[PDB]
Design a protein around this ligand. Sequence first.
Ligand SMILES: NC(=O)c1ccc[n+]([C@@H]2O[C@H](COP(=O)([O-])OP(=O)(O)OC[C@H]3O[C@@H](n4cnc5c(N)ncnc54)[C@H](OP(=O)(O)O)[C@@H]3O)[C@@H](O)[C@H]2O)c1
Ligand SMILES: O=C(O)c1ccc(-c2nc(-c3ccccc3Cl)c3sccn23)cc1
Length: 204
Amino acid sequence: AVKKIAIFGATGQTGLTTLAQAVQAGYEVTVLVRDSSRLPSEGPRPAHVVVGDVLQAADVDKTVAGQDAVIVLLGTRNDLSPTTVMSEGARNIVAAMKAHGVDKVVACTSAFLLWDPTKVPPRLQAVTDDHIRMHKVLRESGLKYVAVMPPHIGDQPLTGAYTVTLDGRGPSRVISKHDLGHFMLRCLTTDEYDGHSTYPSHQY
Ligand SMILES: NC(=O)c1ccc[n+]([C@@H]2O[C@H](COP(=O)([O-])OP(=O)(O)OC[C@H]3O[C@@H](n4cnc5c(N)ncnc54)[C@H](OP(=O)(O)O)[C@@H]3O)[C@@H](O)[C@H]2O)c1
Ligand SMILES: O=C(O)c1ccc(-c2nc(-c3ccccc3Cl)c3sccn23)cc1
């Protein structure tokens, strides 16, 4: 079974609850954070903290070393400018996983990768472009890759009752951040989603 995991993006909206749920479930969690000040000071906390940047290959390498699996929840917070942080970060993660023999990566992009490209809101296209680039890096890596492609991420409660749609869009346009984190961790316990795109959604 999967015991040691690295989480990238652990200080973000979904990352923080994914981190808390992972520790609750008994995982030995390692995180790469740009600033440990953005990690919780009480409650569930990671077993190992690396402070550094996903754009520094040395920082990614020491985060991935020794893990059983990797969770990717990188993002740009509210910045919708053009970016390559997620795809370049993914390149470094793939290289580190290959060097260290880690084969399982669960990575969040967006449901827009499942949309008709004429329907993607132009204001979100620059971020979506790098989600596309990141997905390409991960799909071409040959690793056991679960492509998590959520719709809008909300702040509704944890339910564990969401629908998981494979290789297409699902019947709701929202997933709570807690349920998205729950699903990321579920993907560590099964291989049934490897090589698929997954769309978690629910009605709250
Ligand atoms: N908002 C939505 O409705 C929605 C819908 C579909 C998909 N998505 C996608 O889902 C993913 C996660 O969304 P989210 O809101 O949970 O993430 P988020 O709140 O934007 O947090 C992003 C995470 O990435 C980390 N990060 C950014 N640059 C980094 C770097 N250079 N080195 C190391 N870490 C770095 C941030 O660390 P710091 O604490 O240092 O900033 C933070 O932990 C994103 O890719 C987003 O585009 C979002
Ligand atoms: O299928 C859906 O209904 C759906 C999918 C994705 C999104 C989405 N929202 C954001 C966003 C919005 C405001 C501030 C920050 C961010 Cl990051 C981004 S960036 C890439 C995708 N998205 C919305 C709806």
